[PDB]
Amino acid sequence: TPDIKLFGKWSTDDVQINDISLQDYIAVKEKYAKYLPHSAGRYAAKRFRKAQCPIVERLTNSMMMHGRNNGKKLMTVRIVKHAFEIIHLLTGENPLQVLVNAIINSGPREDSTRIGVRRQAVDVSPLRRVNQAIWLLCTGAREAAFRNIKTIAECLADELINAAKGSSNSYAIKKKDELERVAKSNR
Amino acid sequence: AIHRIRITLTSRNVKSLEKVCADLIRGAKEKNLKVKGPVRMPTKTLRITTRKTPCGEGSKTWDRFQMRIHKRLIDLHSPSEIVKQITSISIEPGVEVEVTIADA
Amino acid sequence: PEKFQHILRVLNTNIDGRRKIAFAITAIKGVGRRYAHVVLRKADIDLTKRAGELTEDEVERVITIMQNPRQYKIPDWFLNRQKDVKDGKYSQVLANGLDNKLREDLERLKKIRAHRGLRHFWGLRVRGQHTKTTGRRGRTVGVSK
Amino acid sequence: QQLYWSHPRKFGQGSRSCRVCSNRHGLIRKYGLNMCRQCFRQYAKDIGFIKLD
Amino acid sequence: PLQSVQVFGRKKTATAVAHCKRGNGLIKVNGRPLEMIEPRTLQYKLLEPVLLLGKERFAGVDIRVRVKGGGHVAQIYAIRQSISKALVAYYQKYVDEASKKEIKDILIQYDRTLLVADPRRCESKKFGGPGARARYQKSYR
Amino acid sequence: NGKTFNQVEIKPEMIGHYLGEFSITYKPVKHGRPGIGATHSSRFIP
Amino acid sequence: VTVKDVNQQEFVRALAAFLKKSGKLKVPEWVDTVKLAKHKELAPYDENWFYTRAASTARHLYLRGGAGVGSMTKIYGGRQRNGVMPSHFSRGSKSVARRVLQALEGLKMVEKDQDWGRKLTPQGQRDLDRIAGQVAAAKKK
Amino acid sequence: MGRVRTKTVKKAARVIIEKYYTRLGNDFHTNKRVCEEIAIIPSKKLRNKIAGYVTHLMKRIQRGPVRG
RNA sequence: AACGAGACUCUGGCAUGCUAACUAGUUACGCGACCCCCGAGCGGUCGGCGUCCCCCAACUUCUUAGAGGGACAAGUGGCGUUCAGCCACCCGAGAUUGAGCAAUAACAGGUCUGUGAUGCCCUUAGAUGUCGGGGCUGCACGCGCGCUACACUGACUGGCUCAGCGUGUGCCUACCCUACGCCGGCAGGCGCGGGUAACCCGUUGAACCCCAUUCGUGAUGGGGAUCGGGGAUUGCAAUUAUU
């Protein structure tokens, strides 16, 4: 009975992670299943402690950002809640599969470091791949809502659905495919 | 006849007030005056914060001065004639002592 | 809908018949958000409708209330002209009448040459403000000779 | 000798001055001190104030 | 007999005290049902212990909670800790220690801070800036 | 005025004003050209 | 069912309807023109605001009795924006609070008490607990 | 970080072991009680540091010579 | 061998163990009182709700604050000229809490406008030692520290519910913090009480935040500069607008 927790409404057991490099860094299932994406946990205190934070809470932290929104975490939990309800109506699928596949598609795997207009190509680690993916799709949702009748709950759903299939209509896929094009010219 | 009668003590320094107050309890207990134990009131802090410079030049440093005040109460069940005896010994240090003839 | 008239002319000024009635009539000078709500409340009009949904006798009821507030029991403490200096009356001044009431006030101060009238004439700040660092509207001047 | 030889001094910087040195600028009214800020840093130890933090 | 215990939980300046006694299954905070504490966005946070342990472990006792200090969110975390810390202290005094271990292990394997306090408090402000670490602007020419 | 007396003929429109409102304590400004130090580029080396 | 057993927002709407249906509560002539507090920018959206203010005020006197006109202006206080300057806290209108307390005394729901202030009568207490049962029954528990 | 012990700690620990070797052992909580009665130490926090290095030195002396 | 470093002093986080409280509380009952029947079951012994009220009841968990306790790189595994030390982990409230104080030798650094600290120089009755009015705020222009915003992750109108640090009747010098009742849209006015303060303002009903409503991508119900008219309060006096 208490071994299965539905996050209010959505099951974790049917979720799959299809890139073997990220299975250690996208925290879902088992001990990482919780009722709400809100805890007071001391995740900042050591270098790799960050990897134990549930991925839905990492999305919730990165969303309370742009100056006028600092510290407002209760508002930011309901944005994620109403985005997952719209994703289920559009796709018919589990919202946690759409988030996991959007993260797997959006993180860049080659990039170029700066040395003097002059650059050199380098590899990207799996912790920086998951950090980059969240920041890109939060930025994509934030830029589209700024002068439209569309709510941020609708823009965050549109951005996650387009990233989960790689459509290149999303901000995150265009920016990933820019970083890897520039680095391919700096080999 | 007897009264319920109240003594209050006050100082800056703590450890002189401890020895004054302990001696008032002993002199009452050995004479069976049925003393009620020392009530510690909350501590009071005075603070003043000032610029260090006499003239307004330099990088802008500050001094933070403070003073702390400590207060106690003891209650006795005794005649008015014998508080005058026990409230007169060991009181030599810089401690205030005040007494009122009825408060209980 | 009825495809009714959606621009209308009220006091030598044009109202868009497309905003909520309480925010359409504030296109008249002398009528702010606060006064427009109280006029419609005395006029017995429902605030939920668009300004093009009023009938011809409803606009005449609002216009005749705006021009005579004191007879429909709008308070004296609400009004924009109080004890007017030349004749002692209380009223609300609207449209092109408000332009002339300010035009008379600035000339009345200038004719006796009081300090207010001179500051209004030289184009300087009239109330207590400083003038060294704010309100700049000229051109940068160079130090060269 | 004149009958008008003073003006009212019942409030403001005309009423009050330092108890040690008669100066009028930067004085402390807190807790009934009425010292100048430069005279306070000079006598604070004898009055019984200390610093810890 | 007066078979009962009183214990407390904390976060920031907030403190909550829970009294529990032999009974039928009542839980109240400040005289109200715990389904009706105002920030209902966090309702699963004060339901967590009874959802995790199951209502059969609560059926023998009545629990009354009083709370003050801190802000709206710090009080939910004080209430949550007072309830789970009261049940294990009541079981330790009045039933078998082998049953206390089931309760403590299931709580800690889900979340610490159901049973141990969070020590974090504010830093003090320092002169020369708006807070503890920030400084005012610097300029040269 | 702080150094001189300015004469006023009291018109009836002046009623309720102060006597000091008709006698002004300063001259209206009109500018001469800017001096050395007025701008950052203005610096002098011997 | 007591006032502490039901969700408080629809209790205020149920109590406001009971006052407004009775026909006995008197209202001031200026109810359509006042600004309700110093820090507001506009008059209230609802023509029925006075009955809602009385219903909330009776509910406050049930939970914490002995209030007076000054302490009611702190309950309905709020933030004032000062244009280009920083914002501060500001209290409610005294005349509205005084006339709302006098209107409830005319229903025999309120008394001026010993020491200083005001409290509910046994008749006021009866009428609030009677409406709390109606609010619970409307949910078909 | 830094856990290096200053000469005030290291010299007091050597002088204790030269005089009282027969009283001492591997238990920190017993060494902490012995060092409080054979010496005057002004601070509780200094007493804990001295009994700590004495406990480290006893475990060395059980293996071979220590030159000081 | 000496000073600086460190130690040292204040502060934060732990104690259901100690001392003990009508200027601090809890639990319980001799009980007493109002309201509800929702409850096995009645309008009850018994249930629910209380900053409703006595105790000549019991007590110290929650509040105050005195004494002691506790942590040492102490335990286990690696790495180290196997020393001095360094990395991970168990157990634990806790394995970097934050401030104060600070050496030798300097600077043509700032201050004579803090002083009855002070040398030399100047002035001293047509005074460079008191009252009345004005200025320090003047505005083509360049620069520095800041406050409010450009909106929908919002603004407006209702409803609900939570802090901590402090100050308070001025000792020449003449003023303090405020409950409650009444009058007024508001600022404000009158009456009458408490507090020299764990005792009274005060259970310090704080803001963002939380729940419901209206607007609809428009320099708009975003923003609130600039400016006209009227009313109170301080003061001996408000114009160059005190608030």
XYZ file of C-alpha atoms in Angstrom, chain E:
141
model
C -5.290 6.074 34.669
C -4.132 9.292 32.879
C -2.413 7.344 30.025
C -1.046 10.344 28.001
C 2.061 12.280 26.683
C 2.974 15.918 25.641
C 5.742 16.565 22.979
C 6.927 19.397 20.631
C 8.212 20.104 17.063
C 9.980 23.239 15.601
C 11.023 25.131 12.427
C 12.546 28.679 12.402
C 10.718 30.603 15.232
C 7.547 28.370 15.070
C 6.827 25.772 17.844
C 3.948 23.232 17.963
C 3.030 21.041 21.005
C 0.929 17.849 20.665
C -0.993 16.294 23.597
C -2.262 12.720 23.061
C -4.391 10.483 25.322
C -6.248 7.121 25.194
C -9.320 7.577 22.933
C -11.041 6.825 19.583
C -9.082 8.638 16.764
C -9.630 12.454 17.057
C -7.010 14.880 15.564
C -7.347 18.737 15.938
C -5.040 21.784 15.423
C -6.080 24.974 17.368
C -9.598 23.379 17.693
C -10.029 22.776 13.876
C -9.953 19.580 11.704
C -6.493 19.179 10.022
C -8.328 19.048 6.626
C -8.953 22.850 7.086
C -5.557 24.509 7.852
C -5.486 27.484 5.477
C -2.586 26.935 2.924
C -4.316 23.845 1.344
C -1.677 23.798 -1.454
C 0.388 21.982 1.288
C -2.473 19.672 2.546
C -0.486 16.495 1.675
C 2.376 17.745 3.988
C 0.245 17.520 7.186
C -1.495 14.301 5.915
C 1.903 12.532 5.262
C 2.258 10.539 8.576
C -1.356 9.148 8.656
C -1.230 8.286 4.881
C 2.211 6.615 5.325
C 1.477 4.598 8.559
C -2.271 3.971 7.894
C -5.239 4.945 10.144
C -5.202 1.606 12.073
C -2.121 2.805 14.099
C -3.978 6.052 15.099
C -7.327 4.398 16.114
C -6.491 4.074 19.891
C -5.637 7.773 20.687
C -7.005 11.349 20.567
C -4.431 14.066 19.564
C -4.773 17.853 20.218
C -2.122 20.245 18.776
C -1.368 23.916 19.705
C 0.961 26.109 17.553
C 2.394 29.705 17.590
C 5.332 31.813 16.273
C 6.904 31.929 12.768
C 4.981 32.254 9.463
C 2.327 30.302 7.480
C 4.710 27.716 5.932
C 7.010 27.178 8.980
C 3.882 26.200 11.039
C 2.937 23.325 8.610
C 6.411 21.780 9.182
C 6.100 22.267 12.992
C 2.589 20.602 13.029
C 3.844 17.691 10.806
C 6.800 16.904 13.135
C 4.730 17.205 16.387
C 2.212 14.485 15.263
C 4.797 11.863 14.106
C 7.046 12.528 17.186
C 4.027 12.177 19.591
C 2.888 8.740 18.286
C 6.368 7.136 18.714
C 6.734 8.612 22.274
C 3.242 7.298 23.277
C 4.046 3.814 21.866
C 7.453 3.778 23.673
C 5.814 4.390 27.118
C 2.629 2.246 26.868
C 3.255 -0.644 24.324
C 6.102 -3.017 23.259
C 9.484 -1.537 22.062
C 9.438 -4.011 19.093
C 6.404 -2.050 17.697
C 8.179 1.350 18.232
C 10.893 0.232 15.728
C 8.323 -0.293 12.896
C 7.006 3.284 13.367
C 10.477 4.947 13.550
C 11.940 3.029 10.558
C 8.971 3.710 8.185
C 9.010 7.482 9.042
C 12.807 8.025 8.578
C 12.966 5.961 5.310
C 10.433 8.418 3.733
C 11.762 11.745 5.174
C 14.096 13.008 7.930
C 12.498 16.101 9.602
C 9.466 13.980 10.507
C 11.499 13.185 13.725
C 14.708 15.431 13.894
C 14.845 19.281 13.899
C 16.310 21.598 11.163
C 18.980 23.836 12.875
C 18.946 26.809 10.364
C 18.263 30.406 11.677
C 18.906 33.921 10.149
C 22.357 35.556 9.913
C 22.532 39.071 11.460
C 22.989 42.207 9.243
C 26.470 43.914 9.184
C 27.241 47.649 8.579
C 28.222 48.765 5.018
C 25.484 46.804 3.139
C 21.737 45.930 2.944
C 22.065 42.442 4.576
C 24.415 39.706 5.858
C 26.637 39.254 2.687
C 25.590 41.970 0.175
C 27.519 45.350 0.102
C 26.502 48.837 -1.240
C 27.897 49.962 -4.688
C 31.517 51.144 -5.187
C 32.580 53.994 -7.561
C 35.846 55.683 -8.682
C 35.789 58.549 -11.307
